[PDB]
């Protein structure tokens, strides 16, 4: 008449079996029942950071009711879940909603403690209009309503520390996030449920993988819900792999290619090759159909097992005698033995394949979930990693120890050997500039991510003053800078596997270094809104110049190590000594030899020829001209940029003079040959 017009019996859904194994949580549900059987303040309300399944603990209460695992005083009861949007949606006329609520409350009064009223998402019932707070304040006052509440911590603190009477009708139950192992047990029960659903096998090392890695690499949500994500999306992935198959797809592309080619040929013998590949495809397809039939039989036998489990639970709730034992004892001899026969048959026959969710599926859903590259080494990435020195000396010549330390950092990343208290490997760079510090970091970014700026390059001259820490972390709440957050925490919390360069750091004012002390030690770090962000999958690199006189004076006649100690003492006199203690390693640069200079000139010529061929102009060059550029573009005092700009001069100015002269014919090899002291461009 009124009740089931708007309410949901979850205990019926437990009888319907559409609910789920609620595992552990017994202390919590006990304390719930304790608050249920009070005199005053009878109404419990659940509190925790979301993901911990307050809905689940309510439904597990309902399951323990239907099982009769509760004590006696709450047996035979009702737990009925009430939407408010069910209540509202027809309230055209005034008072209509209020009459609905009033009739519901009076019929709850008529049930006389039969019903545990459950209301999800409780702070809706705060606001519906007075609406329900006063309009359940009599039912609050009487305690005949035994409402059970559910919320985030916040809307408790928003809305319920606002009223007093509503506060003192409800009793905080601080539901905690579980640990690793209770979550593991919950995962095993719902592993059984997920293999019931998604046509799979799930391996217990994949469970411990899900627990461990989601405890490391997801800084957003909490347990168990992230592990639910991992397992469920791996289930989807295996489902799609079995629904695909790639080898069938390769052969179908091959046969339609050869079919088109033969129909163009209509000598052929491609007729024979097409027929052979069609035969091969048909064989593998028939194998695929047989495997599909095998897994389909597996799903049917598992589903009939589950139907038997539901029926014997009906017999456990009601109290059927000997029919349940006869059903079990007759049934799962044969279903256990031909389940194992189908299991060994699939272990034979699956080729084209996988049915066990392993760790590798979890890792691939990780490295495509956020995208920290944790999956084990597919070799093009791995053999690209192993050539990393040559990769960098595609773009960065010399500075070899720096290259080595950087590659060591990348390797200790991908081996999984990084301590997750910390970022991957931090660096301070040194030496007088233009020797390829910022360009080395950009070359890393071109490697790892395939862009220069897709990396976080924040030069520090934005940060010379105390106040502009809010340019990176941000504004505290309650201002105008509340809708664009930070910029550093943003450009991590999008893509937490990224390079962060803070080039030329020692301009800045050292409260920026206070921020960066929290950075380099722990990697969680308070953003602007009053929460935190992971850093533990980044690399933070900073630069300097500060032993410029020292290195331009003394890189000769010294080793690497005492040079390091000397300029380390210099920066000790500059920074605080913690911030050089926090570094993974300081790497010291050096003045340069003319072979590096010539290689640099080669690199810039290749860039130049790229631009000119995009323009459409074509060059061979004197390399005596390169020698004269080398002899003129040298200095010890700077390095590479004066070479660059001298080359810029002594080529590109008279060259572009001749180009915008309308003089040089496109397509002709522009021989850059020397003059006596200039370098000529001819057309021959």
């Amino acid at each position: 008449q009124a009740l089931k017009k708007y309410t949901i019996d979850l205990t019926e859904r437990a009888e319907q079996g559409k609910l789920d194994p609620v595992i552990g949580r017994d202390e919590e549900i006990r304390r719930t029942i304790q608050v249920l059987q009070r005199r005053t303040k009878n109404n419990p309300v659940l509190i925790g950071e979301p993901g911990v399944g307050k809905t689940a603990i309510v439904e597990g209460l309902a399951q323990r009711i239907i099982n009769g695992e509760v004590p006696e005083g709450l047996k035979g009861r009702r737990v009925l879940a009430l939407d408010m949007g069910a209540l509202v949606a027809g309230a055209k006329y005034r008072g209509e909603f209020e009459e609905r609520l009033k009739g519901v409350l009076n019929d709850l009064a008529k049930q006389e403690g039969n019903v545990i009223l459950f209301i999800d998402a409780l702070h809706t019932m705060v606001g519906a209009g007075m609406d329900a707070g006063n309009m359940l304040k009599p039912a609050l006052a009487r305690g005949e309503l035994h409402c059970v509440g559910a919320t985030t911590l916040d809307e408790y603190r928003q809305y319920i520390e606002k009223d007093a009477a509503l506060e003192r009708r409800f009793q905080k139950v601080f539901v905690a996030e579980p640990s690793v192992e209770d979550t593991i047990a919950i995962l095993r029960g719902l592993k059984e449920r997920y293999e019931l659903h998604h046509h799979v096998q799930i391996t217990d090392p994949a469970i411990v993988a899900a627990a461990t890695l989601s405890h490391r690499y997801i800084a957003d949500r909490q347990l168990p819900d992230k592990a639910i994500d991992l397992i469920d999306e791996a289930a989807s992935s295996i489902r799609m792999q079995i629904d695909s198959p790639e080898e069938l797809d390769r052969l179908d592309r091959r046969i339609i290619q050869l079919k088109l080619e033969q129909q163009a040929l209509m000598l052929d013998m491609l007729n024979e090759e097409l027929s052979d590949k069609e035969r091969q495809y048909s064989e593998l397809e028939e194998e695929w159909k047989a495997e599909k039939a095998s897994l389909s039989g597996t799903q049917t036998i598992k589903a009939e097992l589950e139907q038997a489990k539901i029926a014997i639970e009906q017999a456990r709730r009601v109290g059927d005698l000997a029919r349940m034992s006869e059903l079990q004892y007759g049934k799962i001899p044969e279903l256990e033995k031909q389940l194992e026969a189908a299991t060994q048959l699939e272990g034979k026959t699956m080729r084209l394949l996988r049915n066990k969710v392993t760790d590798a599926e979890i890792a691939e859903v990780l490295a495509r979930w956020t995208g920290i590259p944790v999956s084990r080494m597919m070799e093009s990435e791995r053999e690209k990693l192993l050539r990393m020195e040559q990769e960098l000396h595609h773009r960065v010549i010399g500075q070899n120890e720096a290259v080595d330390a950087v590659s060591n950092a990348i390797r200790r990343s991908r081996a999984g050997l990084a301590d997750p208290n910390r970022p991957i490997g931090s660096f301070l760079f040194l030496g007088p500039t233009g020797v390829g510090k910022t360009e080395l970091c950009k070359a890393l970014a071109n490697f790892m991510f395939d862009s220069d700026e897709a990396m976080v390059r924040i030069d520090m001259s934005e940060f010379m003053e105390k106040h502009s820490v809010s340019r990176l972390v941000g504004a505290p709440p309650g201002y105008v800078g509340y809708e664009e957050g930070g910029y550093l925490t943003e450009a991590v919390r999008r893509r937490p596997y990224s390079v962060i360069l803070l080039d030329a750091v020692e301009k800045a004012h050292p409260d920026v270094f206070n921020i960066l002390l929290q950075v380099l030690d722990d990697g969680r770090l308070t953003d602007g809104q009053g929460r935190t962000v992971d850093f533990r999958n980044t690399v933070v690199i900073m630069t300097s110049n500060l032993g410029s006189d020292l290195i331009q004076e003394r890189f000769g006649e010294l080793d690497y190590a005492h040079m390091k100690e000397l300029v380390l003492g210099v920066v000790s006199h500059n920074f605080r000594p913690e911030f050089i203690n926090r570094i993974d390693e300081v790497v010291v640069f050096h003045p340069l030899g003319e072979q590096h200079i010539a290689s640099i000139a080669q690199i810039q010529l290749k860039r130049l020829y790229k631009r000119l061929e995009e323009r459409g102009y074509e060059i061979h060059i004197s390399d005596e001209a390169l020698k004269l550029l080398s002899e003129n573009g040298y200095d010890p005092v700077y390095g590479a940029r004066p070479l660059k700009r001298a080359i810029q001069q002594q080529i590109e100015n008279p060259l572009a003079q001749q180009i915008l002269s309308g003089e040089l014919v496109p397509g002709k090899v522009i021989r850059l040959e020397v003059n006596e002291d200039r370098i000529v461009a001819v057309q021959h």
């Binding site: 309230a91 055209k92 006329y93 005034r94 003053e465 105390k466 106040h467 309650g478 201002y479 105008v480």
Partner: peptide, 24 residues
């Protein structure tokens, strides 16, 4: 028999500024 409607009742926040005031 007369029914109801639903209203806007809209406004904005109040903001603050904040001012550094340099030492030297």
């Amino acid at each position: 028999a007369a029914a109801a409607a639903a209203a806007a009742a809209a406004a904005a926040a109040a903001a603050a500024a904040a001012a550094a005031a340099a030492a030297a």
